[PDB]
Design a protein around this ligand. Sequence first.
Ligand SMILES: *Cc1c(COP(=O)(O)O)cnc(C)c1O
Ligand SMILES: *Cc1c(COP(=O)(O)O)cnc(C)c1O
Lengths: 410, 410
Amino acid sequence: DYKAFDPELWNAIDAEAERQQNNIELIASENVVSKAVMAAQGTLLTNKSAEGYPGKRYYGGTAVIDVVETLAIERAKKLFGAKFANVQPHSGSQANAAVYMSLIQPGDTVMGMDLSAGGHLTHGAPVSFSGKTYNFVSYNVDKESELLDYDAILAQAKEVRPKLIVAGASAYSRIIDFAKFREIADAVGAYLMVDMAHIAGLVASGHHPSPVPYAHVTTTTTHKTLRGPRGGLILTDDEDIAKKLNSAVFPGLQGGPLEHVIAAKAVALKEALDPAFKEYGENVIKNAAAMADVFNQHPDFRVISGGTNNHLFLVDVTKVVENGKVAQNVLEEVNITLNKNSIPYEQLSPFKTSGIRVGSPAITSRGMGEAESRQIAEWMVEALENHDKPEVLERIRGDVKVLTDAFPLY
Amino acid sequence: DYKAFDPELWNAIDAEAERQQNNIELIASENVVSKAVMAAQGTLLTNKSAEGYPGKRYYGGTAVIDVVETLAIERAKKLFGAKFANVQPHSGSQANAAVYMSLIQPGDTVMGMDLSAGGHLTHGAPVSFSGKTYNFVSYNVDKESELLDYDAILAQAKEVRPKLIVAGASAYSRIIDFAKFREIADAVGAYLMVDMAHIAGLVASGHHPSPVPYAHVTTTTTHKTLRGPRGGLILTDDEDIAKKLNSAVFPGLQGGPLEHVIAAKAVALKEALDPAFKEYGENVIKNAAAMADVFNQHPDFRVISGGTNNHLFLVDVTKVVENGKVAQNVLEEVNITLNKNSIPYEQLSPFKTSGIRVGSPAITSRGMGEAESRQIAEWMVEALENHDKPEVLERIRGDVKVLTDAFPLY
Ligand SMILES: *Cc1c(COP(=O)(O)O)cnc(C)c1O
Ligand SMILES: *Cc1c(COP(=O)(O)O)cnc(C)c1O
């Protein structure tokens, strides 16, 4: 009994397993990985250091590690249709750090999505290494439509003359035209990086256009929609850039890779290669649409861009609670975690925001469908209309338990 | 069930457990973690995105995760004698990157140990962000004694006037005087960073003086001598440095921490707080000494600095095989993994080297003792003397096999 040595730690692990079961996870980044993905991270591959790349290791005894990493590498190439993959990045933050390091120089100018319109921290926030190391100039969505305007971007690009354009977002609901982003990049002589961390699973599933054929380099996380272990991944079709990327990940930015997590990457990528992953993607698309329909129909809420063609959507809540932070707290009391979130052309402080961000991938991996998704948005609408009224929140929390009980987690 | 879906990957994982049993691991960086450490990494805490810090998270649903991270922080503060601890770095390299971001500006001068006397890549290699981002100037050991010379280092520091001195090494056998390093830093108005990755276990066990009282900031891997999951850890007693370290790690450098690996850190730190960890420490010291003795007493080999007071030691092999690369290969042939290693004032090319590096932590962790340790060194001498005599190697493999059988890995 290894658990018996450390009850304080393993009682917390049980408490979290319980907490998850009794919690509706609507946070768009979140998912529920298979038992195989978890099992793989908990193997004795943690024991073995593999500084270097397959058949170019610093150390010996690395023959079987090369099989595991080469599987992961080959499975990502096959799934995403890329000539080159690096599976060693510890996180999406590090995968992004390696691409910047490979394509541009400290102080060089970079275009990323506005951080209220769907841009990521790592796409130029001044509190991120990304902001501090490079000159980031944001491109917005159109104010009226809340859509990417490829004409407006192209004209801004022509003035800013960036060395690099970043596309991909964590709060944009609509299909990105990657062909148009590359057309713009080519129009001004810049690289295109696509950070697809949010949509990588929808890309695996067929439901989002691939940026792989259009981006010079594509980064993603292996967690989020792709539903793998916590980590990062870099794809490219350019052999010269693959060489630079490999160098930047190690020994540029990282030391030894987490080969146990890389075994969980290989596993999860094989799961994404299965026809059942197409079904999952389909249900991610429907479940999010079902939830968003409910906010569309209700007069006191506006969905950003009018709806969604991916795993998530934002809602302006400001007609019903003071701000997004309030919205967020209220729903935690009914055992529904989402997150406050900026909306295009945000008026309020970044700590308050005008919006909530809903996502479908977690409830979808639990086995929930459109009925359940609609039900959960009605509950969100009731709880938020009745933020004042604890007797009301208390009834809803009891209904949430009925539904969580109904849909086990593992 | 779930392994049937992916036989290719789970057979490679069976292959690596086999290989690990049938191999004598003397790579000094390596260890054998407990079943609890692997188990904790294989739990559903990978599903919870926890950006931020305990009671200051971006997302709700994070109360239990706050218990698991605070366990790790508190266990690290207790074990190491530190007022502040950050358990979020994905690796030693990321831990180091966060400390540089916290204490110095890009282009500032840093002294670290030479990448040939025991310096790490992250201590100024031109191929690491360390060398690229900062002005690294390396300090050496005395040519004659192979010891750090605290008077020479002070003399160098007065000339180079660094913002930061890095102490700590990956190939140095002797007790470091952390008070002397701080005296030098204080003498020249420099911060002191100690990277104790290789010796964190022997510090935990009480067999190596703590740097914690003397370093402005201590970094380490949670793996290596401390026998934890692969990751990093930062320690300081300065509240204002702790605030900057925390910002640096997130959102400066990382995104979401690996809360499952943090759980495993928490397990490992409680393991190293146990009295049994002191015996592990004692046995690491005796076993490495036993192995060093054999190279000392043999005329054709020289141990660097004449021996060791920690877990590792270097041997000049060049009076027996052409270089350290050949030594590494011969020994792989008989199921002993170690690494070629630059020695002080290395004459040969980095790729070839004069030296081998032996460590006791891994065999110590498999329950081996002084007798076994001496046998392995005898076998290494025999094998190397008789390198191009396949008759002999075959018999040593057979012998090794008998010993690996005798000490099950798990
Ligand atoms: C191993 C090591 C590191 C880096 O750890 P990774 O987890 O490989 O990034 C840094 N410093 C020292 C002294 C080390 O031994
Ligand atoms: C989550 C995310 C990242 C960073 O991933 P971490 O593993 O948390 O470092 C980067 N970019 C995007 C778009 C993301 O969604």
